[PDB]
Structures are given as structure tokens and as C-alpha cells.
Amino acid sequence: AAAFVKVSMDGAPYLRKIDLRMYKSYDELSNALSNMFSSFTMGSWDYVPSYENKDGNWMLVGDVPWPMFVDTAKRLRLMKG
Amino acid sequence: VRTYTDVQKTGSVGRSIDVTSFKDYEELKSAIESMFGLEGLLTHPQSSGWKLVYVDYESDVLLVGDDPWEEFVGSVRSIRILSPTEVQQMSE
């Protein structure tokens, strides 16, 4: 049951896509992303993830437990402090 | 009615190709490689520093290869080659 969203890093040159169904915990998602943008990050992780629900609004990542997260989130964005 | 998606590179002159002529991502890169003389730089185990990106019909700019092939053929609108330097005018 694959679940592919887009991931935007602010300031990144381009955007990426991930399959959420290939990960199990938030922490398992978080270190997966830091390595996607690892080539951008070098030169810790100081960004905060946000997703966007089905009604088109931006919600912070981590509140709702993981299984409902994978069904709720349609797009990803990592903002800088 | 076939795709005929534009492929573009700064300093060379653009090309139009049909992505359905190829079955997977690798064949798409290897063809684009041989068209601009970049053979070996888009398809390298060690991530050459050249990047290939596309624009989807939602007008975002995305790395080629993430989307499953079958969705991408339908989403892709224009493709573009980015030199190591170009990749970084775009970073911040």
C-alpha cells in the first residue's frame, strides 16, 4: 500500500518524493529525510517538519501517532527556524 | 497523441523526447546522457554532482527517479539538466 508525498526543503534547489509506507516510526522517517537532503545540509538537523492534511492546511509533524499520520499527510515541508 | 517532453540544458540547444519510448528511469537517463555528451554522469553509483530534474503538472521542480515510473510519465511536463554549478545558484 504505497504512500508517496512530495518533500520541500526551504532553500533546497529541488524537491523530492518519499514512500511513507516504507517507514515505521517518525524517527525512522526523520533520519531518512536528513540523508535525502544530506548533500544540502553539509556546508545537526535544525529544521522542523510540517505536513498538509486533506483539507489543505499545514500541521506540525509528530502530534498524531504514526499510523494515522501516513494516511493524513499529502505533502511535506521542512522550515528553517 | 504522444508525450514529446522537452529536455533542456544551459549552453546546449534543447531536445524533445517521448518518455514512453523507455521502460525505466535508467534508460531515460542513459538516452539523455548520450544526447548531450554527459555519458556516465546521470547514471553513476557515486552521484556525479550533475542532477536531472523535471517539472510536473502541479508546477513543482522535482528530482527525476523518486516517483514510480508509471506515475511520472503522466506527471512529467518538462525536463532539465543541472550542472554542479547550476545546482548551487539554486541552493541557499
Side-chain angles (χ1 to χ4, degrees):
Chain A
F4 265 112
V5 297
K6 295 175 186 180
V7 202
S8 147
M9 192 170 271
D10 306 333
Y14 42 82
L15 271 61
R16 303 276 254 119
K17 263 166 137 189
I18 44 184
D19 186 8
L20 290 180
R21 196 95 43 205
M22 266 182 17
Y23 308 86
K24 300 158 251 275
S25 60
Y26 279 137
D27 299 335
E28 187 167 318
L29 180 68
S30 100
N31 57 17
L33 291 196
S34 96
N35 288 184
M36 295 213 323
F37 299 86
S38 71
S39 87
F40 178 88
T41 322
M42 295 157 167
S44 325
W45 82 298
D46 322 325
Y47 294 64
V48 309
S50 63
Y51 66 102
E52 77 145 36
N53 61 353
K54 300 165 86 160
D55 311 284
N57 296 52
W58 289 86
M59 256 87 80
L60 167 55
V61 171
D63 303 324
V64 152
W66 173 270
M68 197 201 157
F69 172 85
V70 174
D71 262 306
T72 325
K74 314 314 215 203
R75 190 202 175 85
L76 274 177
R77 176 182 154 190
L78 294 67
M79 301 140 102
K80 178 59 176 171
Chain B
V1 196
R2 293 215 110 163
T3 70
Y4 281 131
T5 312
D6 313 316
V7 177
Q8 301 207 190
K9 174 176 167 331
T10 288
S12 323
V13 52
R15 300 286 280 286
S16 268
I17 69 187
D18 174 296
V19 278
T20 85
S21 46
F22 324 114
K23 316 306 163 187
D24 60 308
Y25 278 134
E26 199 261 345
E27 282 195 294
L28 176 74
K29 300 191 184 176
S30 275
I32 293 180
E33 272 188 343
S34 69
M35 286 168 77
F36 294 84
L38 315 164
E39 304 111 12
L41 308 160
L42 304 188
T43 83
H44 200 271
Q46 289 257 30
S47 85
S48 96
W50 286 76
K51 268 33 203 181
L52 180 62
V53 313
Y54 68 112
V55 195
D56 73 336
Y57 275 97
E58 318 176 21
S59 299
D60 283 295
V61 161
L62 293 124
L63 190 59
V64 159
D66 294 336
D67 221 20
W69 176 261
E70 295 309 329
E71 292 309 281
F72 154 87
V73 177
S75 278
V76 67
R77 176 187 194 176
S78 54
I79 314 173
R80 179 178 286 274
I81 304 163
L82 306 188
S83 66
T85 314
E86 275 190 286
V87 160
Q88 263 214 250
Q89 314 189 237
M90 307 186 71
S91 314
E92 297 139 304

